[PDB]
Amino acid sequence: MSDPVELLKRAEKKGVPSSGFMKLFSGSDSYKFEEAADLCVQAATIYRLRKELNLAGDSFLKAADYQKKAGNEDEAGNTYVEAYKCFKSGGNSVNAVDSLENAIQIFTHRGQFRRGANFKFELGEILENDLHDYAKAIDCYELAGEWYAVALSNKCFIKCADLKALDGQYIEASDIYSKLIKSSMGSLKDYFLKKGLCQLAATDAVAAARTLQEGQSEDPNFADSRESNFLKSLIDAVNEGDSEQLSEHCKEFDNFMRLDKWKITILNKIKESIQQQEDDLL
Amino acid sequence: MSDPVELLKRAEKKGVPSSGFMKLFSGSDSYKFEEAADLCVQAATIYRLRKELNLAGDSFLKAADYQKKAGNEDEAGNTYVEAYKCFKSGGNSVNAVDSLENAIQIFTHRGQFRRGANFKFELGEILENDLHDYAKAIDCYELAGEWYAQDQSVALSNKCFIKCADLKALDGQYIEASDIYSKLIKSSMGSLKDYFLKKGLCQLAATDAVAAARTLQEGQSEDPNFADSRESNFLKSLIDAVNEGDSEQLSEHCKEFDNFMRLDKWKITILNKIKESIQQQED
Amino acid sequence: MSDPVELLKRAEKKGVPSSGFMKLFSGSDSYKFEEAADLCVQAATIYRLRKELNLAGDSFLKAADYQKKAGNEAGNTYVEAYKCFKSGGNSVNAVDSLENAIQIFTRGANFKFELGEILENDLHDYAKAIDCYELAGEWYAQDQSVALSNKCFIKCADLKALDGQYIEASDIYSKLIKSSMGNRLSQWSLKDYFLKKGLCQLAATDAVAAARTLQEGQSEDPNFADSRESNFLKSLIDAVNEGDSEQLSEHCKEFDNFMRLDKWKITILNKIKESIQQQEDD
Amino acid sequence: IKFTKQSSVASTRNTLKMAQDAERAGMNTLGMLGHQSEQLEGNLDLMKVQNKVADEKVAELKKLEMELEIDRNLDQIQQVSNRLKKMALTTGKELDSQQKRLNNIEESTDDLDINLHMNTNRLAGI
Amino acid sequence: SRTAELQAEIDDTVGIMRDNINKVAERGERLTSIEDKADNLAVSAQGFKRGANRVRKAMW
Amino acid sequence: LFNDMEELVIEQQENVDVIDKNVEDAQLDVEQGVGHTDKAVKSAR
């Protein structure tokens, strides 16, 4: 097998654009860039065969850059996707994020907004789990959902609303939950609940009651659902300012339907808001 | 980022076909149209990124027209789908309808009646909800169901026919709605429980109580499930009420039916016209 | 729109192979056949747009023949011929088109199952339908598609039992039982399978084999042991053993009262009762 | 007492009927999903190989009593539900697997089309 | 207790089926996508066949 | 719920059919094309 380092050196040698007098006799530089990209791809496949995933990703990145210089944007985007794949497999989240960004830009510029949305969702996943950059993940999910906008957009909006509510943006999360409810009208059972919870995290008990009434009147399944009773109980508890009653209702709800960390955080902030109200009582 | 207006101007400049003497030395105009379409697509993506959805839709439309001039009909159809897509997101229902029409024509002309049917169903939805053009929605749904049937897709044709029959019954065409319900019953034999009911209701909106009784008997004898269903009893009660001309009895039966199974606006309209037909009979 | 008749005439004119001296200067005839096939496809799409489904099917058939002569698409065109002939009510031409498409593909199993359906319902050629179903099931088994092969074998066994071939139908039911054993999804199918098998064995005057099948089903599948089908099969076996046709009729009515019988069972039990009558003649 | 029991009997009869309808529904869906799974990759693999060959050839070219009934109904409905949820679960697994395979096929097809485009362009160059 | 267990099992199965129903929506969309790229692929394959044939004739 | 599940799958049956068809034709036109490039290379040498 050829030495990947020698192939990369040859690609770099061929990747130098024609300059000065030579430009008047040398044809289009696109062919040189194409050859350099092919050499980089060969060296990088050799790296991948050796499980040196990060070097292979760097070599795909160089090949993608050369392809961009050659005008073959689609091949550059595919090579960037390969860079993202091998960087993610290699544990290099930052380079994977960068590769996904270039691929997304290339795809969006070429009218492939579908590919852009898929890779934006993957980028948001990488940001949320690997890098913990929750704001960028929210942006990626929102954008992916917008381009997707029923089911994929609904998934992206679920992720966006979840992160936004966990990030202190309860009103925006509730708005996204309303959008999800409207798109899914005619997940809803939970949506209503979650929305109300967010409205209750924002201390807007009236909005939570309005959401509960809308869900009860619009969706017969939600009206008789345990989620509706739990939301009504939470609304009543916040209205009476009985934090212990809210805790009892949460335990009762957990006993039949297990709560998730999102709900834990929302209700914890709600209880701390009751404590803050108790501070305002003095 | 490049100025979308400048890109559109460049596309328009390149989109001029070769004329006169220049045509003898200039190659095929297809490449110029392709370049103009690419420039329009770039400008339009920039616009969409700016959330100017209507301008982006107009630019996809220009790109699709240039692609048509270039002979790339499939790319034109995809771009038209993009025009419809962004117009619908932008609230411009008319331009969305137009884009769907060009895309549907392109797809049908290329043998992709499936894409045509999907987009015809979407067009009918747009007409029914956004523009309230119920006749065109009925036509779109009927055509989409027919093409889906030609593809052996029983369920989508059944969905399209449900929509078509619903709109037709709401539009005063009870006999045609009942015929479509019969088609749905035949395709679905082996939704039915309701179909029979709905069909009978339509036949009762047309004052043809005998046909409603025939439909009830056919449903009872053919589908054991429908025979013991509450829908069968309700239809029989309605048939009896129309036969005796007791409008109050029909209202009582409707309330009883609502108490256990909630009625929908379609049924409300059918039974209201039936009661008003009893009032006309009273005249 | 172009005249489909003129297009077909042009296709026929172009479809003439080069002969004699001209063959020494004319290139490969494949291109002429391809052009004729394209012209036929255009004329046929025009026919389809006019709802003249039979003419469109004939034109697809001509295009498929030309494609075969060109070495290519002919089978797919045959599939289109089958589609439009079936929509046009011409079952014979649909059968022919499915046969050519099946031969080309050998997809063959799917179109063989469709062909068997056409034979059974439209043309009532039950023997050919049985052959098609058996072959389709065998090929599906060769692809490890257990459920499709099981469906084809259900159809084959049903037709074979209705056709007087009780032993073969019972063998196919045994194959179905063996393939569906251990699968939680097909439990009920098994519950019926055993019954049907026994019924076939009882239609063949083979009461001992029916008892063996009942015992095997009871011991192997706990669900079948307590199922109403097992009790009904045992009652039928006892009735045939005592030669009490009226008792068999009473058991059939009791079975119908809780679980409706189907025409297949009606025929099997009618032949069984007529066999008791034949024994009474004896 | 009798009227309530009769209403309960009618309710359970309809519930059993509905459950069987569902059982008739889950099984055909599973059959078709199995069929579509078989339909769904080999041709794409062959095309990948043929595109490799095309790449190298093009490159070279360029170089060149009533209660009892109620209980029975209950029993039946339970059995139904049981294997109806088995069906449901496997069908969900099926959905999942098929969608992964779908993504895969899509990627492969796109790649092959790009390859073909490239080949034709380079052939035009030759 | 038997009827309550039956109700619980039925609810769980409805849960599974709506989830499965959300996956099949994703699957139908994906299939429309793969029928859009496969059409493109067929067109491109025919174009490649024709182009290769034209080059075959050129070299000859 | 099961009912719509069997309705979406009937719909998806159309999609699977055409996809299978288009991909086979494509693999059929790629093989012929490769044959043509082979003969072209044989001549160009």
Buried b (16+ CB within 10 A) or exposed e, D12-21: beebbbebbb
CA distance A83 to A98: 9
Residues in B lying within 8 Å of C, measured between beta carbons: 111, 150, 152, 224
Give residue numbers after which chain D breaks (C–N above 2.5 Å). Answer: 40, 64
Is residue B253 within 8 Å of residue B268, measured between CB atoms?
A: no
Which token pair is C124?
A: 């009532």
Is residue A63 within 8 Å of residue A35, measured between CB atoms?
A: no
Amino acid at A221: N
* Of B111, B150, B152, Cβ closest to residue C45: B111
Which token pair is B150?
A: 């030609």
Please report where in the chains the tokens 């009871």 appear, as a residue: C218
Nearest residue of E to residue A256, measured between CA atoms:
E8
Q: What resolution, expressed in A, was reported for this entry?
A: 4.1
Nearest residue of A to residue B79, measured between CA atoms:
A111
Is residue A57 within 8 Å of residue A24, measured between CB atoms?
A: no
Contact B45 A111 (CB under 8 A): yes
CA distance A98 to A96: 5
Contact D34 C184 (CB under 8 A): no
B and A touch with 3+ CB pairs <8 Å, answer: yes
Asked if B118 reaches chain E (Cβ–Cβ under 8 Å), the answer is yes
The neighbour count for residue F5, using CB atoms within 10 Å, is 25
Contact D109 E19 (CB under 8 A): no
Please report where in the chains the tokens 């096929």 appear, as a residue: D105
CA distance D19 to B194: 17
CA distance C58 to D85: 48
Is residue E28 within 8 Å of residue E35, measured between CB atoms?
A: no
Contact F10 B155 (CB under 8 A): yes
* Of D85, D89, D95, Cβ closest to residue E27: D95
CA distance B92 to B168: 26
Q: What angle do CA A8, A10, A13 make, to 5 degrees?
A: 110
Residues in C lying within 8 Å of B, measured between beta carbons: 45, 83, 87, 260
CA distance C183 to C11: 54
Which residues does chain C have within 8 Å of residue B150's beta carbon, measured at their own beta carbons?
83, 87
CA-based nearest residue to C49, from B165, B71, B146: B146
Kindly calculate the radius of gyration of chain A based on its CA atoms and give it in whole angstroms: 26
Contacts of A221-225 spanning 24+ positions with Cβ under 8 A:
A221/A188, A221/A189, A222/A188, A222/A189, A222/A192, A225/A189
Contacts (Cβ under 8 Å, ≥6 apart) of A201: A165, A170, A266, A269, A270, A273
Among E36, E37, E43, E46, the residue to mutate for chain B (most B Cβ within 10 A): E36
Please report where in the chains the tokens 């009769």 appear, as a residue: D6
Which token pair is A180?
A: 């999800």
Q: Considering Cα of F18, then F19, then F22, then F24, what sign does the dihedral take?
A: negative
With 0-12 / 13-18 / 19 or more C-beta atoms within 10 angstroms meaning exposed / middle / buried, residue B33 is buried
CA distance C173 to C196: 7
Asked if A264 reaches chain E (Cβ–Cβ under 8 Å), the answer is no
Is residue D105 within 8 Å of residue E33, measured between CB atoms?
A: no
The three-state DSSP-derived secondary structure of A207-225 is: HHHHHHHHHHHHCHHHHCC
Give residue numbers after which chain E breaks (C–N above 2.5 Å). Answer: none
Amino acid at B145: G
Nearest residue of F to residue B192, measured between CA atoms:
F3
**Residue B130: alpha-carbon gap to chain centroid:** 12
The neighbour count for residue A205, using CB atoms within 10 Å, is 17
Question: Please, which experimental method was used?
Answer: cryo-EM
Q: What does DSSP assign to residue A127? A: I
Is residue B216 within 8 Å of residue B178, measured between CB atoms?
A: no
Which token pair is A90?
A: 């290699």
CA distance C119 to C122: 6
CA-based nearest residue to A115, from A84, A70, A72: A84
Which residues does chain F have within 8 Å of residue D57's beta carbon, measured at their own beta carbons?
34, 37-38, 40-41
**Residue E51: alpha-carbon gap to chain centroid:** 30
Is residue C202 within 8 Å of residue C237, measured between CB atoms?
A: yes
Asked if A74 reaches chain D (Cβ–Cβ under 8 Å), the answer is yes
Q: What is the DSSP string of chain D?
A: -HHHHHHHHHHHHHHHHHHHHHHHHHHHHHHHHHHHHHH--HHHHHHHHHHHHHHHHHHHHHH--HHHHHHHHHHHHHHHHHHHHHHHHHHHHHHHHHHHHHHHHHHHHHHHHHHHHHHHHHHHH-
Which token pair is C78?
A: 């045959």
Contacts (Cβ under 8 Å, ≥6 apart) of E49: F29, F30, F32, F33, F36
Which residues does chain D have within 8 Å of residue E10's beta carbon, measured at their own beta carbons?
81
CA distance A123 to A100: 7
Among B72, B153, B192, B228, the residue to mutate for chain D (most D Cβ within 10 A): B228
Contact D111 A74 (CB under 8 A): no
* Of D81, D99, D124, Cβ closest to residue E27: D99
CA distance C178 to E21: 31
Is residue D113 within 8 Å of residue E41, measured between CB atoms?
A: yes
Q: What angle do CA D44, D49, D51 make, to 5 degrees?
A: 90
CA-based nearest residue to A59, from A31, A95, A29, A97: A95
Contact E10 D81 (CB under 8 A): yes
Contacts (Cβ under 8 Å, ≥6 apart) of A222: A188, A189, A192, A215, A216, A228
Which token pair is B110?
A: 């290329």
Buried b (16+ CB within 10 A) or exposed e, A220-253: eebeebebbebbbbbbebbeeeebeebeebbeeb
Nearest residue of F to residue E14, measured between CA atoms:
F1
CA distance F30 to D11: 61
A-B C-beta contacts closer than 8 Å: 13
With 0-12 / 13-18 / 19 or more C-beta atoms within 10 angstroms meaning exposed / middle / buried, residue C153 is buried
**Distance between F24 CA and the closest CA of chain C, angstroms:** 9
E and A touch with 3+ CB pairs <8 Å, answer: yes
Is residue A231 within 8 Å of residue A210, measured between CB atoms?
A: no
Contacts (Cβ under 8 Å, ≥6 apart) of A190: A227
Kindly calculate the radius of gyration of chain D based on its CA atoms and give it in whole angstroms: 28
The three-state DSSP-derived secondary structure of chain C is: CCCHHHHHHHHHHHCCCCCHHHHHCCCCCHHHHHHHHHHHHHHHHHHHHCCCHHHHHHHHHHHHHHHHHHCCCHHHHHHHHHHHHHHCCCHHHHHHHHHHHHHHHCCHHHHHHHHHHHHHHHHCCHHHHHHHHHHHHHHHHHCCCHHHHHHHHHHHHHHHHHCCCHHHHHHHHHHHHHHHCCCCCCHHHHHHHHHHHHHHHHHCCCHHHHHHHHHHHHHHCHHHHCCHHHHHHHHHHHHHHHCCHHHHHHHHHHHHHHCCCCHHHHHHHHHHHHHHHHHHHC
Is residue A150 helix, strand or coil? coil
CA distance A208 to A196: 4
Contact C185 D35 (CB under 8 A): no
Q: How many CA atoms lie within 13 A of B263 on its CB side?
A: 20
* Of D30, D38, D79, Cβ closest to residue C185: D30
Which token pair is C217?
A: 């089903």
